[PDB]
Structures are given as structure tokens and as C-alpha cells.
């Protein structure tokens, strides 16, 4: 559901969904083309 998210200061608004992209263990963000934040991991429970 559309919801404000504040991931350790990473502030944004959007619909968060169960991710299906494979972040390698050294990756904590996700960028699409034109640098749009497409996926994020939780700094607390480590969920993509």
C-alpha cells in the first residue's frame, strides 16, 4: 500500500513489495536506469 518509508534517514514514499532481484551481499540499494531507487534493504532486519 502507498506508504512513507524512512530507512535510517532514507526518506521516500511508495509501494513496497516483495523483491525479486538478487542483491549480492555487498549491496544495500538498488538503482534502475536514470538512477531511480528501485529497491532497498532494511538496515534492521535486512529485507529486500
Amino acid at each position: 500500500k502507498c506508504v512513507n518509508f524512512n530507512f535510517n534517514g532514507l526518506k521516500g514514499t511508495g509501494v513496497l513489495t516483495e523483491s525479486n532481484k538478487k542483491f549480492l551481499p555487498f549491496q544495500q540499494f538498488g538503482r534502475d536506469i536514470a538512477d531511480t531507487t528501485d529497491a532497498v534493504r532494511d538496515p534492521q532486519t535486512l529485507e529486500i
Binding site: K21, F23, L24, Q27, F29, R31, D32
Partner: peptide, 23 residues
Amino acid sequence: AYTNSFTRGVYYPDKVFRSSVLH
């Protein structure tokens, strides 16, 4: 005592996933 590194040495520079997009 010298030899060339053909293309070795590159690495993932910044830990922000990108799929199928030339960075």
C-alpha cells in the same frame, strides 16, 4: 620482471545493484 595485465583489475565500485544497464 614485468608482464602485462590484459583486462584484469576491475571491481564492483559502489554496491548499488544495476541490472542490464551499462554504467
